[PDB]
Design a protein around this motif. Structure first.
Motif, PDB file in Angstrom:
ATOM      1  N   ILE B 254      -0.783  -8.958 -16.140  1.00 60.30           N
ATOM      2  CA  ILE B 254       0.036  -9.690 -15.172  1.00 60.30           C
ATOM      3  C   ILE B 254       0.369  -8.866 -13.922  1.00 60.30           C
ATOM      4  O   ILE B 254       0.556  -9.424 -12.843  1.00 60.30           O
ATOM      5  N   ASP B 255       0.421  -7.543 -14.080  1.00 61.33           N
ATOM      6  CA  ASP B 255       0.931  -6.629 -13.049  1.00 61.33           C
ATOM      7  C   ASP B 255       0.438  -6.912 -11.615  1.00 61.33           C
ATOM      8  O   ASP B 255       1.265  -7.111 -10.730  1.00 61.33           O
ATOM      9  N   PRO B 256      -0.898  -6.943 -11.384  1.00 63.79           N
ATOM     10  CA  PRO B 256      -1.396  -7.189 -10.024  1.00 63.79           C
ATOM     11  C   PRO B 256      -1.018  -8.548  -9.438  1.00 63.79           C
ATOM     12  O   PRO B 256      -0.847  -8.658  -8.223  1.00 63.79           O
ATOM     13  N   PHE B 257      -0.900  -9.567 -10.289  1.00 63.58           N
ATOM     14  CA  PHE B 257      -0.409 -10.875  -9.856  1.00 63.58           C
ATOM     15  C   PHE B 257       1.064 -10.794  -9.440  1.00 63.58           C
ATOM     16  O   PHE B 257       1.446 -11.318  -8.394  1.00 63.58           O
ATOM     17  N   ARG B 258       1.874 -10.119 -10.260  1.00 64.41           N
ATOM     18  CA  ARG B 258       3.288  -9.876  -9.956  1.00 64.41           C
ATOM     19  C   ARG B 258       3.461  -9.046  -8.681  1.00 64.41           C
ATOM     20  O   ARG B 258       4.351  -9.319  -7.869  1.00 64.41           O
ATOM     21  N   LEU B 259       2.600  -8.046  -8.513  1.00 61.66           N
ATOM     22  CA  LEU B 259       2.615  -7.198  -7.325  1.00 61.66           C
ATOM     23  C   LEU B 259       2.281  -7.973  -6.046  1.00 61.66           C
ATOM     24  O   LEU B 259       2.961  -7.808  -5.032  1.00 61.66           O
ATOM     25  N   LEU B 260       1.250  -8.817  -6.097  1.00 63.43           N
ATOM     26  CA  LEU B 260       0.868  -9.646  -4.947  1.00 63.43           C
ATOM     27  C   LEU B 260       1.916 -10.718  -4.628  1.00 63.43           C
ATOM     28  O   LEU B 260       2.074 -11.119  -3.475  1.00 63.43           O
ATOM     29  N   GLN B 261       2.632 -11.163  -5.659  1.00 63.09           N
ATOM     30  CA  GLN B 261       3.719 -12.126  -5.511  1.00 63.09           C
ATOM     31  C   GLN B 261       4.910 -11.525  -4.755  1.00 63.09           C
ATOM     32  O   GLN B 261       5.710 -12.250  -4.164  1.00 63.09           O
ATOM     33  N   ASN B 262       5.013 -10.200  -4.783  1.00 62.17           N
ATOM     34  CA  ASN B 262       6.109  -9.477  -4.143  1.00 62.17           C
ATOM     35  C   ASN B 262       5.648  -8.639  -2.945  1.00 62.17           C
ATOM     36  O   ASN B 262       6.337  -7.709  -2.528  1.00 62.17           O
ATOM     37  N   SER B 263       4.487  -8.991  -2.397  1.00 62.21           N
ATOM     38  CA  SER B 263       3.876  -8.269  -1.284  1.00 62.21           C
ATOM     39  C   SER B 263       3.575  -9.192  -0.109  1.00 62.21           C
ATOM     40  O   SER B 263       3.531 -10.416  -0.261  1.00 62.21           O
ATOM     41  N   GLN B 264       3.363  -8.592   1.060  1.00 57.37           N
ATOM     42  CA  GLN B 264       2.998  -9.333   2.259  1.00 57.37           C
ATOM     43  C   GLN B 264       1.983  -8.545   3.090  1.00 57.37           C
ATOM     44  O   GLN B 264       2.335  -7.586   3.784  1.00 57.37           O
ATOM     45  N   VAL B 265       0.722  -8.961   2.996  1.00 54.26           N
ATOM     46  CA  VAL B 265      -0.389  -8.307   3.688  1.00 54.26           C
ATOM     47  C   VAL B 265      -0.811  -9.138   4.896  1.00 54.26           C
ATOM     48  O   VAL B 265      -0.783 -10.372   4.853  1.00 54.26           O
ATOM     49  N   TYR B 266      -1.200  -8.451   5.971  1.00 55.74           N
ATOM     50  CA  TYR B 266      -1.589  -9.102   7.222  1.00 55.74           C
ATOM     51  C   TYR B 266      -3.065  -8.896   7.542  1.00 55.74           C
ATOM     52  O   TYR B 266      -3.701  -7.971   7.029  1.00 55.74           O
ATOM     53  N   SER B 267      -3.603  -9.764   8.395  1.00 48.54           N
ATOM     54  CA  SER B 267      -4.989  -9.652   8.830  1.00 48.54           C
ATOM     55  C   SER B 267      -5.166 -10.054  10.287  1.00 48.54           C
ATOM     56  O   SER B 267      -4.526 -10.995  10.762  1.00 48.54           O
ATOM     57  N   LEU B 268      -6.044  -9.335  10.984  1.00 54.41           N
ATOM     58  CA  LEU B 268      -6.492  -9.736  12.313  1.00 54.41           C
ATOM     59  C   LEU B 268      -7.369 -10.976  12.188  1.00 54.41           C
ATOM     60  O   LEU B 268      -8.260 -11.037  11.337  1.00 54.41           O
ATOM     61  N   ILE B 269      -7.094 -11.967  13.028  1.00 54.68           N
ATOM     62  CA  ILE B 269      -7.810 -13.239  12.996  1.00 54.68           C
ATOM     63  C   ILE B 269      -8.526 -13.473  14.323  1.00 54.68           C
ATOM     64  O   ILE B 269      -7.904 -13.446  15.387  1.00 54.68           O
ATOM     65  N   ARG B 270      -9.838 -13.688  14.246  1.00 55.89           N
ATOM     66  CA  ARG B 270     -10.645 -14.068  15.400  1.00 55.89           C
ATOM     67  C   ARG B 270     -10.317 -15.507  15.798  1.00 55.89           C
ATOM     68  O   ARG B 270      -9.874 -16.294  14.954  1.00 55.89           O
ATOM     69  N   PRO B 271     -10.515 -15.858  17.086  1.00 52.42           N
ATOM     70  CA  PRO B 271     -10.347 -17.256  17.492  1.00 52.42           C
ATOM     71  C   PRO B 271     -11.311 -18.176  16.747  1.00 52.42           C
ATOM     72  O   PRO B 271     -12.447 -17.784  16.465  1.00 52.42           O
ATOM     73  N   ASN B 272     -10.839 -19.379  16.421  1.00 55.15           N
ATOM     74  CA  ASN B 272     -11.604 -20.376  15.655  1.00 55.15           C
ATOM     75  C   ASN B 272     -11.777 -20.057  14.160  1.00 55.15           C
ATOM     76  O   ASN B 272     -12.551 -20.720  13.461  1.00 55.15           O
ATOM     77  N   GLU B 273     -11.052 -19.047  13.679  1.00 59.40           N
ATOM     78  CA  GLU B 273     -11.027 -18.723  12.253  1.00 59.40           C
ATOM     79  C   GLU B 273      -9.806 -19.333  11.576  1.00 59.40           C
ATOM     80  O   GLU B 273      -8.707 -19.322  12.132  1.00 59.40           O
ATOM     81  N   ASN B 274     -10.012 -19.866  10.376  1.00 64.22           N
ATOM     82  CA  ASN B 274      -8.923 -20.375   9.551  1.00 64.22           C
ATOM     83  C   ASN B 274      -8.311 -19.223   8.745  1.00 64.22           C
ATOM     84  O   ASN B 274      -9.016 -18.566   7.978  1.00 64.22           O
ATOM     85  N   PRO B 275      -7.001 -18.960   8.938  1.00 64.91           N
ATOM     86  CA  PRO B 275      -6.293 -17.915   8.186  1.00 64.91           C
ATOM     87  C   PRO B 275      -6.290 -18.148   6.675  1.00 64.91           C
ATOM     88  O   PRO B 275      -6.306 -17.181   5.908  1.00 64.91           O
ATOM     89  N   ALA B 276      -6.269 -19.416   6.262  1.00 62.38           N
ATOM     90  CA  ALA B 276      -6.302 -19.781   4.845  1.00 62.38           C
ATOM     91  C   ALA B 276      -7.631 -19.398   4.196  1.00 62.38           C
ATOM     92  O   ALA B 276      -7.670 -19.044   3.017  1.00 62.38           O
ATOM     93  N   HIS B 277      -8.709 -19.464   4.976  1.00 62.02           N
ATOM     94  CA  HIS B 277     -10.039 -19.058   4.520  1.00 62.02           C
ATOM     95  C   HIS B 277     -10.189 -17.537   4.446  1.00 62.02           C
ATOM     96  O   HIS B 277     -10.838 -17.023   3.532  1.00 62.02           O
ATOM     97  N   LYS B 278      -9.593 -16.833   5.410  1.00 63.33           N
ATOM     98  CA  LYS B 278      -9.449 -15.372   5.360  1.00 63.33           C
ATOM     99  C   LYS B 278      -8.654 -14.961   4.124  1.00 63.33           C
ATOM    100  O   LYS B 278      -9.017 -14.003   3.437  1.00 63.33           O
ATOM    101  N   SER B 279      -7.569 -15.688   3.859  1.00 61.22           N
ATOM    102  CA  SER B 279      -6.737 -15.479   2.674  1.00 61.22           C
ATOM    103  C   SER B 279      -7.519 -15.661   1.372  1.00 61.22           C
ATOM    104  O   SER B 279      -7.425 -14.824   0.473  1.00 61.22           O
ATOM    105  N   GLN B 280      -8.291 -16.746   1.282  1.00 60.30           N
ATOM    106  CA  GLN B 280      -9.102 -17.027   0.093  1.00 60.30           C
ATOM    107  C   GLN B 280     -10.072 -15.881  -0.189  1.00 60.30           C
ATOM    108  O   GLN B 280     -10.188 -15.431  -1.326  1.00 60.30           O
ATOM    109  N   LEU B 281     -10.750 -15.413   0.859  1.00 61.06           N
ATOM    110  CA  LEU B 281     -11.708 -14.313   0.759  1.00 61.06           C
ATOM    111  C   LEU B 281     -11.089 -13.040   0.176  1.00 61.06           C
ATOM    112  O   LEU B 281     -11.667 -12.416  -0.711  1.00 61.06           O
ATOM    113  N   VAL B 282      -9.913 -12.669   0.682  1.00 63.73           N
ATOM    114  CA  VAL B 282      -9.221 -11.456   0.239  1.00 63.73           C
ATOM    115  C   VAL B 282      -8.608 -11.628  -1.161  1.00 63.73           C
ATOM    116  O   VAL B 282      -8.585 -10.680  -1.949  1.00 63.73           O
TER     117      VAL B 282
END
Ligand code: 0MR
Ligand code: 0MR
Ligand code: 0MR
Lengths: 437, 437, 437
Positions: B254-282
């Motif tokens: 469970i640990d990594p799921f619990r860790l991601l639940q309590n974390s906030q990671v950011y990403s650079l987004i190119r124009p015309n890119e969906n952030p939700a799709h960037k999120s899915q990939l990561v």
């Protein structure tokens, strides 16, 4: 660019001739504009000029709106008079191309309307090979356009009928060479040579041709597709001020879609028939789309193109023993949401593309489920006949053809911005014997 | 219980070291907390410490928020200075495990981002074997954790590259033994022995390895799956007051799921890119889920996990020739509805389970319909290669693995109440060449 | 017409006898009408008369509504007394047909409730052959009706149990002839002759029977289907004024549907059980529909008939160690939207029908897509065992049986206007080992 302009010129001349001929026939018969644009009248007039060239009279049923009712009348014309009207509408020339064009339209309609399973079983062919039977109602000695439009199975069928003196050998070798040009793999072409080179063709050649036809279900041949419309569409356009010689015309580009968008064709409707289903049938015929994926046809048209067995309609032509008092007329919806270039290609036959994808999963999570894998593909990896078999075994229903090519907006005349769609496929898949869809 | 506590201790020590190292690097670079939690900055810092161990300088792009815009700057560090910072964050030790952990995270991201079809065709492998290519961007001489995480096809690929003095033989035999341990059937293991025992390995060994790789699409091997997160997640947790050494840590629980639940990671987004799709990939990368059934991934995440070809996003890393003035930053949604234990198992390979089901119907009623039957299964029933073939022939996409095991609520820390879900599967199944989904 | 009237007469006599017997038993036991129409009471009474014919006492649990609670009581009857009650309800005669009718109802319930995978693996049979196991809980020496109702796999199972003096040979040859009559192809029938003609049957006969059973998954045998209802339905109808001898009765026509439409049967329900799922189970049993396509069953019933693994219910019978204080009773919904004739046919086995359809597309438009084709069908075209294999290879899940036949409205007593429906199929397809649906 210059080659296209030249082709458009000759095609535009051909279409203009058909148009002027049809206008002339409508005036001779004293049909109203609406009556002239009834498709049943168009088919009779088309049949008359084809019969005149292909007692010494020709005719058929002509339908008129008289006293609020639809009336049928059998008219008869001298075959020589019709021939003179055709030749002179085409500026003195025989114009065999215009005749062949009308034959292909008739062929494309027959392909959409009737299944030739009786003709198939007589020649020793599988009745499920219908998708290979484009142009099967065309005569053996058709034109260059007729030969190009004929399917692999049609050529196989005609060749077996030959098997079942000097001019017979030339005809046999010509038809082998027509078939050979349709095949996209060398292995298929080589087998056609082996059939062509046969002195006294018999059962071994029959078996080879059946083998080749079945291979063309997977390793598909290059069959031409031409949008050929009822003569009333061309006649109505010429009459309204469209000059096909000055504008040019194309059978495979935007032109026929643009023409149908600016046309209004009518049909006699039997009681309990859906006009939309009559429309679908004629639309499919117009764009030579009987054997297309119904998904592709649906997306282009903008409305669902359903299987033949779901259509609440019979044939376009009205039999002479049918009651005219129950007949109504309605507009045929022959327009489309999008348009698409008609292809000569049979799709990819190259099985050595080293194509990328995924045919199994690797479990990451401990969760109850089945584990998907592509069984036939995985298991498949474990002289000319055996190579063809192996190429067929390599192919998959999932493999993509026409990469990068899409449909177009009706306003996109130069075809600059292709719309690639996110892809029941068989039109003849829904019958009382098989649920192929 | 005591063995798990011991494993959690060492893993917790490893994660703590990565965390302290990342905090140190963020202070050295004077990054803000938000900037430190940008994933592109994390990847650069991770790359620098890996390069320092794996002129004599290392560096990469570091991204800062300056005057309302995102700015890129190329920084350079002495490789010796980075090595000292890593060692001292890990209490004097080299801590090769932490380095390998960051390598696996990079590997899991690469597996989600890029398809290695060029590398596959060079080694004589089918590009459709991608689901077997976990850890293919990892070096040959990786760690124990690196070897466990590598797929069957990765091992096959590395072994063929060997085929194409004394230390070369030991490396060859070690990699054969790594591959052998992944196989779950004796017949597959025996074939690996026959490849390992080969004096002067060549074409016969190449063919055997290709055969074994293809068998692993159906008779899947035991590949480890570890949730390995960007260093910024561990750094941010240590900084915020989480003690991984006292709490312990697990890569598969469970640990990594619990860790991601309590974390906030950011990403650079190119124009015309969906952030939700960037999120899915990561998210997929974080849980080593590139080659999982998309149905399983979707159910766990709580939102649809779509194929790669449907994702409106490019890679995470920003190329040096890209314009920074058009770059925006956004939060990566890396949370999940449920969690699930990561497995080492490849699912059921036992084809002698005498499994119960139904593969045909018997008509009761006189009604028109087709009569369903499972054709491939029914027809299938009619030395080591042929046994493996037979075992593959017995298997079905319908067969269930991980019986009784399910997903869990994030609040279910002890994994007491499994939710068994009611089950497009291929992430790399949607391309311009194949519609595998 | 006259032959049907004669059959209806004898069947009507049989049903009348069962009805009068059940009424008598209900009065003997002093059950209320509601209690008499509880299915658990019906099963006990049915079991008692079967046990009496098939210390010297018989009995079982009888359930009464006492002081607002359901109570269980074990009653015992002299076997001779029960035999006298049965004989005299059937006008002096033994009436073995009525007994066999109740046995088939029990068999049809068992087929719907339990999978006999343990019995299958013991006989060397594939547990997935369940659709062939109709009547497998019936005794070997059943009636003529019992033999007709038994599946191909049941006959195979019974024959292998024989393999594993003079009366043993006659029994063996009789069962071979019963099985032979079920097969619809000559090739299957010939193989049964080859098994029947065997002096000292052994392993070669075992293998032939396993082969024949598996062939019956595709080339299905003629198995009879009879709607056999709990005795309480017949008893309640006789009591209410229905004369089965004057009206006649049919097991395969509208009659049982009409009877269930005018009946009200009850069931004991365990806590956490869905009454609708209990209803589905008994409805399937009533019409011998365990091994039917769930699509056909759903369409007839008017509500979804879900797989066994989706049913929130256990067996109908309540074990003696179950707590009665938690038991509730509810109505069984045993009605249907439509009705359909029960068939003896196993569907089409003729693979030489020269069937019409479509198994590929020919591209008309230049648009990106995959090109659908029916792979197994196309690839399939490339002494008695090999013929049967070839016939199985020719068959397709898409092939249609019972052409022109449909379901009927409950008001359509003469079956004049068939409704042909537009067609998850396997009832036992949803388990923890296989997702066959
Ligand atoms: C642009 O307008 C005119 C244009 C010509 C003549 C009269 C008018 C005109 N004069 O008044 C009005 C009002 C008019 C009008 O708007 N239309 C609608 C279009 N229409 C028409 C268009 C086409 N083809 C293409 O446009 C095309 C475009 C690009 C490639 C290939 N083909 C075809 N064809 O391809 O067979 C048949 C027809 Cl009937 C002619 C009449
Ligand atoms: C219980 O609270 C704390 C707990 C510890 C430290 C601080 C707090 C705390 N102090 O103040 C607040 C407010 C807090 C708080 O609520 N959280 C949320 C959870 N969080 C967190 C939890 C886990 N793991 C498990 O819980 C777990 C449970 C069962 C098995 C395996 N793992 C992991 N991990 O597994 O990597 C990372 C993180 Cl960051 C820590 C902070
Ligand atoms: C027509 O009415 C009666 C009819 C008879 C007796 C009493 C009544 C009657 N007297 O008062 C009322 C009120 C009544 C009434 O309406 N019903 C409903 C139908 N019902 C019933 C019907 C059938 N069969 C067919 O009808 C049938 C029709 C066509 C073919 C095959 N079978 C069966 N059967 O087939 O087993 C069981 C039962 Cl219980 C009998 C009682």
């Amino acid at each position: 660019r210059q080659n296209a302009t030249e082709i458009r010129a000759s095609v535009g001349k051909m279409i203009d001739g058909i148009g002027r001929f049809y206008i002339q026939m409508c005036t001779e018969l004293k049909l109203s504009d609406y009556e002239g644009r009834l498709i049943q009248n168009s088919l009779t007039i088309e049949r008359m000029v084809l019969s005149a060239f292909d007692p010494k009279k020709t005719g058929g049923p002509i339908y008129r709106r008289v006293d609020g009712k639809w009336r049928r009348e059998l008219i008869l014309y001298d075959k020589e008079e019709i021939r003179r009207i055709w030749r002179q509408a085409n500026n003195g020339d025989d114009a065999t191309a215009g005749l062949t064009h009308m034959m292909i339209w008739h062929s494309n309609l027959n392909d959409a309307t009737y299944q030739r399973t009786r003709a198939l079983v007589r020649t020793g062919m599988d009745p499920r090979m219908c998708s290979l039977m484009q142009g099967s109602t065309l005569p053996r000695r058709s034109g260059a356009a007729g030969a190009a439009v004929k399917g692999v199975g049609t050529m196989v069928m005609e060749l077996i009928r030959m098997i079942k003196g000097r001019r017979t050998r030339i005809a046999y070798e010509r038809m082998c060479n027509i078939l050979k040009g349709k095949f996209q793999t060398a292995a298929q072409r080589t087998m056609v040579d082996q059939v062509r080179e046969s002195r006294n063709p018999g059962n071994a050649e029959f078996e080879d041709l059946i083998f080749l036809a079945r291979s063309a279900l997977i390793l598909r041949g290059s069959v031409a597709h031409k949008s050929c419309l009822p003569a009333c569409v061309y006649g109505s356009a010429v009459a309204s001020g469209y000059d096909f010689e000055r504008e040019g015309y194309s059978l495979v580009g935007i032109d026929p879609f643009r023409l149908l968008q600016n046309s209004q064709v009518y049909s006699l409707i039997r009681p309990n028939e859906n006009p939309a289903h009559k429309s679908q049938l004629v639309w499919m015929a117009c764009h030579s789309a009987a054997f297309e994926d119904l998904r592709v046809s649906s997306f282009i048209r903008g409305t669902k193109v359903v299987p033949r067995g779901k259509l609440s309609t019979r044939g376009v032509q009205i039999a002479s023993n049918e009651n005219m008092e129950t007949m109504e007329s309605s507009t045929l919806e022959l327009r489309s949401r999008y348009w698409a270039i008609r292809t000569r290609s049979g799709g990819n036959t190259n099985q050595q593309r080293a194509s990328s994808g995924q045919i199994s999963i690797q479990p990451t999570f401990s969760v109850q489920r089945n584990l998907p894998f592509d069984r036939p593909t995985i298991m498949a990896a474990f002289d000319m006949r055996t190579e063809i078999i192996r190429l067929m075994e390599s192919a998959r229903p999932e493999d993509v053809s026409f990469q990068g090519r899409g449909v177009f907006e009706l306003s996109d005349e130069k075809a600059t911005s292709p719309i690639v769609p996110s892809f029941g496929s068989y039109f003849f898949g829904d019958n009382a014997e098989e649920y192929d869809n």
